[PDB]
Design a protein around this ligand. Sequence first.
Ligand SMILES: [Zn+2]
Ligand SMILES: [Zn+2]
Ligand SMILES: [Zn+2]
Length: 81
Amino acid sequence: RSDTCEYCGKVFKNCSNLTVHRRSHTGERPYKCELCNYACAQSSKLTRHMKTHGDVYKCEICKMPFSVYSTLEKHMKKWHS
DNA sequence: ATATTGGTCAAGG
DNA sequence: TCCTTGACCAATA
Ligand SMILES: [Zn+2]
Ligand SMILES: [Zn+2]
Ligand SMILES: [Zn+2]
């Protein structure tokens, strides 16, 4: 059948889209990255985020790998300024 | 301009 | 039939 969001009243034809959407109300983020503190509500978002980890540049303080050097540079300023 | 991300949507495996 | 997957678009911590 169909289902409706208990928080905002939005109706969903695909019930799995409600499961993901509801997490935007509850703050639930069950998909956690093993290579950084990233956490998301949608499994395929973690798959996408993983491409940013890995050719590969590695932070020499926290050992975190990065595919794009500029993303590593931003990681330096945020965690090791 | 770029890289990355949250919310959205549904094709198709 | 239905959940997984990933493309699309707008926003940027
Ligand atoms: Zn809602
Ligand atoms: Zn990560
Ligand atoms: Zn680091």
